[PDB]
Amino acid sequence: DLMDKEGKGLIEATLDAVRMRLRPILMTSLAFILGVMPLVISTGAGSGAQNAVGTGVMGGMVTATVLAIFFVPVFFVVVRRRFSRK
Amino acid sequence: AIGLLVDDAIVVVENVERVMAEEGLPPKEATRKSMGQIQGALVGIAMVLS
Amino acid sequence: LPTGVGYDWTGMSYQERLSGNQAPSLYAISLIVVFLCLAALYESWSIPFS
Amino acid sequence: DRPIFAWVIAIIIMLAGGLAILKLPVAQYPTIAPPAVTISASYP
Amino acid sequence: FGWFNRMFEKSTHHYTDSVGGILRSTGRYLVLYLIIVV
């Protein structure tokens, strides 16, 4: 929405985009993990199925944000896929 | 679902909150052109979640 | 074993199990619909691969 | 009007359409006649 | 509070300048993505 509508930014539009939304990526991710916290442990008798659900998403969200918003793709991708050839 | 529920609500509210600071503007029209950026996703994500 | 002795799998199990056979096909169409929906609101051949 | 969006509607028909041929009867003509029940006893 | 002063420091410094660092490179972090798939 910045590349087309506004200005290109070969690498300075993807970087300028997270400059104005590191907030909601860590607002959802942090609030989600805390809402799944009661299932991961806490309840340990009433229903053991709670532990089966919350373990598979709490572990997956730490790695789907402290990884996505950084280091490995979700930034790197848009570079080599759109740019670099066509 | 609770997770994929307050997430969709989060993007609508806080993207206005930046629009009310980036270019300090409280009014109704601040909320309208916030959906210029968001609406494109809103329906897009709805399809790929399905 | 000797003649006049065959077999038939009795008898709750199954009709195409879950971790196996099923799962592969379910995730396969999940990639074909994710790719198409990321394109209806984007128009490219690069954005959806991200 | 636009390329992508229209072609993606047609690609839904490529799957779901060719999925109906893999998941629906392939037989002769359908049910035609009024369906009848038939009793049959035997006194030898 | 100092909670807002921290959020603006990490996001703007720190994170966004280290996003400039990762974007300069490419071949190392792609081979790291492939090591994640292994």
Say if CB A15 and CB E22 are below 8 A apart. Answer: no
Tokens 């598979």 map to which residue?
A56
Resolution stated for this PDB structure, in Å: 3.6
Greatest C-alpha distance within chain D:
79
- Cα torsion B27, B33, B38, B39 to 10°: value is 110
Q: What angle do CA C33, C40, D15 make, to 5 degrees?
A: 35
Choose the closest CB to D2 out of C33, C43, C44.
Answer: C43
Peptide bond between residue C14 and the one before it cis (omega within 30 degrees of 0): yes
Say if CB D14 and CB C29 are below 8 A apart. Answer: no
Amino acid at D5: F
Tokens 């394109």 map to which residue?
C39
Report the C-alpha gap between A12 and A14 in whole angstroms: 6
Say if CB E36 and CB A76 are below 8 A apart. Answer: no
Report the C-alpha gap between A11 and E24 in whole angstroms: 9
Instruction: Note whether A77 contacts C: Cβ–Cβ < 8 A.
Output: yes
Which chains have 3 or more CB–CB distances shorter than 8 Å to chain C?
A, B, D
Say if CB B50 and CB D12 are below 8 A apart. Answer: no
Instruction: Inspect the interface and report whether the beta carbons of C41 and B50 lie closer than 8 Å.
Output: no
Residue of chain C with shortest Cα separation from D6: C40
Report the C-alpha gap between E30 and E22 in whole angstroms: 11
* Direct distance between the N- and C-terminal alpha carbons of chain C, in angstroms, rounded to an integer: 57
Taking contacts as CB-CB distances below 8 angstroms, the residues of chain A near C49 are 77, 81
Which pair of structure tokens corresponds to residue D36? 């009848």
CA E12 vs CA A18, A64, B25, D9, E5: distances in Å? 10, 21, 22, 42, 11
- Give the closest residue to A6 by CA, choosing from A27, A23, A20, A22: A20
Method used to determine the 3D structure: X-ray
Peptide bond between residue B40 and the one before it cis (omega within 30 degrees of 0): no
Which chains have 3 or more CB–CB distances shorter than 8 Å to chain D?
C
